[PDB]
Design a protein around this nucleic acid. Sequence first.
RNA 1: CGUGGAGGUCAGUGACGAAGCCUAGACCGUAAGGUCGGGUCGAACGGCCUCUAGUGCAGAUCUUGGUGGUAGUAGC
RNA 2: AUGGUG
RNA 3: AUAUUGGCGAGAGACCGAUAGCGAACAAGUACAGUGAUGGAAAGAUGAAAAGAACUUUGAAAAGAGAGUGAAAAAGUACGUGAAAUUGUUGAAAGGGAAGGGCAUUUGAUCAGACAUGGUGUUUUGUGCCCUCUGCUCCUUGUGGGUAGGGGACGCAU
Lengths: 169, 392, 136, 124, 125
Amino acid sequence: SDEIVWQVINQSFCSHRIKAPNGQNFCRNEYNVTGLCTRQSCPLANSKYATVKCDNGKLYLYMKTPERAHTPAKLWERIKLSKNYTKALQQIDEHLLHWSKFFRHKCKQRFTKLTQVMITERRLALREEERHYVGVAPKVKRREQNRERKALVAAKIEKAIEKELMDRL
Amino acid sequence: MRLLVSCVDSGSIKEVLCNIGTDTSVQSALQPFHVAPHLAEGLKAYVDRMWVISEDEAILARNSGVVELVKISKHLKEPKFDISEFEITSSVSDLFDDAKLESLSSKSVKRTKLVDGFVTLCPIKKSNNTFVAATKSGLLHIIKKGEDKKLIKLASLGLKAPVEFLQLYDLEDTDTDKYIFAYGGEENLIKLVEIDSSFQSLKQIWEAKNVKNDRLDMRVPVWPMALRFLEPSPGKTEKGKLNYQFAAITRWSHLTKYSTQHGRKPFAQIDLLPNREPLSQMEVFDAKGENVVSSLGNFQSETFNELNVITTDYKKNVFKFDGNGRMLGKVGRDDITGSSTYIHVHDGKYLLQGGLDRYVRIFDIKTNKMLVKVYVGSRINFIVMLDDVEIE
Amino acid sequence: NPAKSASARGSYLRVSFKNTRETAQAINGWELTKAQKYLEQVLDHQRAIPFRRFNSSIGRTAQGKEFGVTKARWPAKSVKFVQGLLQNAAANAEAKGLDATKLYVSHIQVNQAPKESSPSHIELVVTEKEEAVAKA
Amino acid sequence: PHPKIVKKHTKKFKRHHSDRYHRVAENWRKQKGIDSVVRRRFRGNISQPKIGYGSNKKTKFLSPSGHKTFLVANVKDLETLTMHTKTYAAEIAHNISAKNRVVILARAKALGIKVTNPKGRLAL
Amino acid sequence: AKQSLDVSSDRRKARKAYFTAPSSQRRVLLSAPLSKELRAQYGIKALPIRRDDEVLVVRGSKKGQEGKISSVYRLKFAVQVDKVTKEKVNGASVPINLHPSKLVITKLHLDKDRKALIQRKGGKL
RNA sequence: CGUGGAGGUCAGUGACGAAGCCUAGACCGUAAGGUCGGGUCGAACGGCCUCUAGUGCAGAUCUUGGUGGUAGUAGC
RNA sequence: AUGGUG
RNA sequence: AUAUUGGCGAGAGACCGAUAGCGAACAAGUACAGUGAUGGAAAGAUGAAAAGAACUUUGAAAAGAGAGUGAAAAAGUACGUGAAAUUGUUGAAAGGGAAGGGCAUUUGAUCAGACAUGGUGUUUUGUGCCCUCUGCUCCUUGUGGGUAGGGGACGCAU
């Protein structure tokens, strides 16, 4: 039962966990709220869980329960969510009903964030056509510098000037 | 060979004469016989498009807004070969309107002003003197050349401007008399217009509508660049709907495969390239060098999967794709240095090439080797293959 | 400035590091042919060459009054090698097309070599001093 | 925001006699010599490390600009920061190529995360 | 996988045995692929290279150049194809070595042992 | 905390430059240490969970190598 | 101490 | 059945990776020393390929310069990487009786120093995942997904 699956995840390793330089350690699972694998956010030890996730469409609320626990290929249920931030939030705290406060409180947030993200990405889609990033490989550098140096060296550069001036005379 | 190439610098038409295998990049390879300017009228008058029904008769579309007419004849040279002389028999002038365009130059994303020019010149029908000449500005000058030896203006007609491309659907037959164009352009969905031999009457029989909003719940842009028809679709022919199939290229790299019987949306719009790579023109080739096409280029067969196309960017690249979009591969990859302005599949077994690079190039479809390369020293927008010739 | 310059190099000489060192240092900045003049005048026991560094067992000598020092010496071996360096540097210079009237020694260097002798590696870049270096 | 960030001691500790010798390095090590001056803490000598310098659990590990630091490699990794853009800022482990950095960049502005070390390997 | 107890997987061995291998064995380690038209033509895949025949170059900076082998150099595990040529600046022309795996064989040089060879593996001709 | 190798795991990173070395650059650790920015370089390498050691240097008239002062000295 | 070269 | 550091072949390693491991990865019981028994070293790496630098030049010279080859001589048989000690040059800075460290500022130099460029509304106007018709599909059959066509005016753009 689940608390064991936790404690196994809290001593042995998850395939996914991060341990940032400060003491706290993320959880890189695709499906979770908050992205920190701790007792109440780690999707692998809950058995009852709900998050929000983008499809590339709008934001499907994914839900699971104990009953499909053994049937992973289809475990997560899924719902879409409206384009009304207001109506969305009402849908979210709708489906979640007596799901404990954690998931309403947080799921709502993940919605807010991903929506904002969308909006930004929409702005940035419209901006600054100019000055893309570019890398330059190292040997590109070395090559350019040297070949240039030799370029100048080859041109004694005054002989051209004077000879052009004797020309003009 | 004997070819013609439009020289944008002097506004002339060069003729090129040489064998398969030519290159000017080295003194070793075999050399061109002849290159000639002709009838160079200046940067304004450079040739926008060119058509030759039969070897002596070639019609000029001239960016001054002037259609001319060209009589061709061989004569002694100066081994052995012949060249020709190019002089204009007929003309009809001032066919453009700039100001209507200039009023919309603000909405487009392109450069500064928008010149009026010929986006189509061709015969109708495939045995006929008729010519449908298109302008940027929407003005359709339909002009049959009278047997008087002279060109005569049949009509000027309107379009929903500007008009980037226009196509005539000949795949059925010469007979049925009622002609379909498809045209499109800036933020301008693809439109099917029809015209009677009364040549005063155009009703718009069909119009596409754009695909649904994209991943970001934003709106995909609308810019159809080029359109090539197929046969009507086999199967049960359906209520109230025209039966046609056609496929179109957008600036935004979308390949767009339209089947009317399905409806107004495209049933496949597939980006060929990463992140909105701008494309241009089009060619429909076939794998084996085979000739699958009409004389104005519409591919002949009723299933897309059998389609293969050549499309260019604005930089160097020239690509070969299937109906699905899976890239067959680049052409001239290691060679082309510049914007490739013009490409025309010839005989299904050849590839015309030329552009800003100033090398006219000729590649082979199946081998994918460069056959011919000539340095005209000019930007060249257009190429026509005249007689393939013997060399004496 | 490399565009107007000439380089002579020498390496794997067998000399004394210290003597070659100083006798290199003495001419830094001098005009070309006045330099040759010097090395000539100093090889024949006229005007010896001051040693500011290694002064043990160096007899007080008058002519050093030019440089601010009572100590100097007439080293044989050194001014030979650096002499030649000035020769070939003049060759490199002329075939370059430089101007011997502007030509002076902009850089001179010696530094040690493997091994028990004290071989040397010498570097000199002469260049033609130009009137009017930089506005601004 | 955050409290005001106070280091308690901002100068790196050096090993006794580090500079008078090269055969000795600059990484702090203790003095076990029971006679030594640095061990018995005579006036005027260097300052040992000792626990009291330990910083403030609130702002500990905070980079100055106020975020923390979290060290990412590919984009799939920074997606863990969709939640915390207000606490963690993420930077790009050194060996990343110049090919993928630009990807982490674009996507990292869309999310609105602060990348401490952009401009690494990227020109314009 | 390695089932047979008596083969060995050691890297260091197989390196040694590769660099000590005698010219007999350096014959067959040079097997080069026949081109496709030959793959069907003589009904086979790749056959040890000899001196006189004609070959085409697929990989390497030499792409598309082809010729008939001048000599074949079994000490340096190479083959010197004709008219694939460096020129030291004095005009002398040194053959670029081409390791054979990267070659494809256009024209054979058919000898009676090339006949019986092509026959032993099952090629029809 | 760090070093050498191992069993997992990051579908980790890497010729668009892995290691390594320089650094009058930055940040993090109280510290052991860590992590990034430039620079040189060319082919492997790292983080988390655990195992195992030939695992951490200022010294030993320490060993081996390289260098100096002694000094162009006593001297030949 | 054993066994050896002078 | 057991023994086995020698021989003659094999297969392997949580072994060592050039001061390690055999003493010896290389022309090692080699050069060497001893009268003789005997004692016994150091020393691996260009590159993809020698294309190991034509040719002109100073110089008898050892070397140098111009010029090329190579992706890189910033890889030239002193050759991958190139550390420290220690030395030369150029510049800084102080010094004349000392250097070094600790707490603190000063002055000089010097470096870093956002693709921040929005948010909340309010209106005008197109489009569509909105409205209204008409379907189709998969299954955890539920307060669900997926998808098409004809039209019309909640998210998006303006």
